[PDB]
């Protein structure tokens, strides 16, 4: 289910799953899960509360920041 987990200083951990999904554990206690085939993203706050967002919803700012950092992480994997 898990592949190689990569540590990114100043950000946190980034892991790729067998299902083609990426799971990021940020150093602020939040988590982010995305999948290639799915049209939604999962965000978990530091307090353990999960919220799923769709592609057509306006996302909060911090979600977009973490999606940007995730985009950078995927970029450096090439």
């Amino acid at each position: 289910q898990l592949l190689k987990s990569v540590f990114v200083k100043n950000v946190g951990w980034a892991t790729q799953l067998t299902s083609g999904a990426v799971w990021v554990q940020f150093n602020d206690g939040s988590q982010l899960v995305v999948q290639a085939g799915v049209s939604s993203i999962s965000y978990t706050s530091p307090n353990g509360q999960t919220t799923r967002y769709g592609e057509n919803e306006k996302l909060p700012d911090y979600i977009k920041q973490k999606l940007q950092c995730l985009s950078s992480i995927l970029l450096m994997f090439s």
């Binding site: 790729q16 083609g20 990426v22 995305v34 290639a36 306006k58 985009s71």
Partner: peptide, 22 residues
């Protein structure tokens, strides 16, 4: 699986462009 990762990169980029247009 670099394929699924590339598809994921394109997906996240499209989502970010769409979010910029909101």
């Amino acid at each position: 699986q670099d394929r699924q990762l590339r598809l994921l990169q394109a997906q996240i980029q499209r989502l970010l462009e769409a979010q910029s247009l909101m």
